[PDB]
């Protein structure tokens, strides 16, 4: 399956993504985990040290490959065929999970970054449309890496939000952008829930059938989110709850 | 960890074992799954066809190896060193799970089977005491393959029973034999629960802290237990419940 996980906050949302990826390794022989959020470290939540994650060259820094896929001076290519060279664009964390880091885009400094952006786009296209393997791509609230073309291949867009007015609004906007792009299913995972009043707030603004699951706030999560990996470990209190969320996802996608 | 799963019934108990093994593959790089119950097919519940499971030569039929480990005519050896040749005594089901089948012992036909029994015993000893890898051994209510020596290496003995007087008695006897052998922890998994009255019966005869988990009887389990694998699949209704049982086990063992 092809999954997209989006939201603000950063680590919180990335924590859910890493959790699903790890659980997914039991059902798939290979998973492409794509870090498309420069503000959080997907590799870290997947068990690597922040250092090991950053030692993986990001897509944006593969100049030799970018030259080879878009042309060398003058020679322009708007549709780079990179689906065959994917394994050179990241590192296997283990026998099943292959991590790719997009890297951050240069917002806009009067310089030309067309070749770079074309290269990133071609990799995202390859992963979602050409590769058969499972893909989980972690991204920001703007989901700017998805296009109408790749959106048709997405099995589900998961918006991760916190139980408050502003975060709920963010999620509804994610849902708006995804629908506009043509994504078939959008579902929510509510994170950092502290009290029941907050759960009632969620139920008031969001359809319950659209809620994949609820993850309670963890005190051992604010003072321990960089040692014993994450919520996918069998010792973590969210372990079982996370598998329920995964089962609902699997059933939803078919 | 080193686990032993015992009970009557056969498939029911073997179903729990296979479930734990599959879930365990996420936490361990290699697991020795040992079918020590000739009445049920552990490999089948682990995803193989009954045919593929039976094409794996059982310990009892490795005459060449048995000769090489106990002597050849006259030459007797009561303590065969077979911990180094384990990978020749089974088949890898996949990249992590290695299946070994004990085969059935000749109850007693006036023939000498000392060499055979010594060989089986040496393999069980090697797995529990010498190998570092995780081991899950499925066995009958008599747990006759365990000895006081190997019992010291067992992290937990799991007795699987049904909610009725006779099955409860069976489990208490399993607990008796295990304690006598010196096994440190015995825990229960109650299977095929049909109603709440039965749950009350369990609570009446067994300490609740000793109960790892309860598995409801499945109607799609009586008419579907040889097609879509088992309870470890993400589409199975017992999926989440099984992970809760696994977490309690992990926490118990430490
Ligand atoms: Zn340009
Ligand atoms: Zn003899």
From TrEMBL, chains A, B:
Residues engaged in binding ADP: 10-15, 40, 191-192, 216, 218, 221
Keyword presence, Isomerase: no
Chain segments annotated as coiled-coil in the UniProt record: none
Gene3D superfamilies hit by this protein: P-loop containing nucleotide triphosphate hydrolases (3.40.50.300)
Recorded GO MF terms: ATP binding; ATP hydrolysis activity; metal ion binding
Gene, per the UniProt record: cooC1
Name of the protein this chain belongs to: CO dehydrogenase/acetyl-CoA synthase complex, accessory protein CooC
Keywords, alphabetical: ATP-binding, Metal-binding, Nucleotide-binding, Zinc
Domain CobQ/CobB/MinD/ParA nucleotide binding: 4-230
Positions that bind Zn(2+): 112, 114
One GO CC term, this protein: cytoplasmic side of plasma membrane
GO biological process entries: negative regulation of cell division
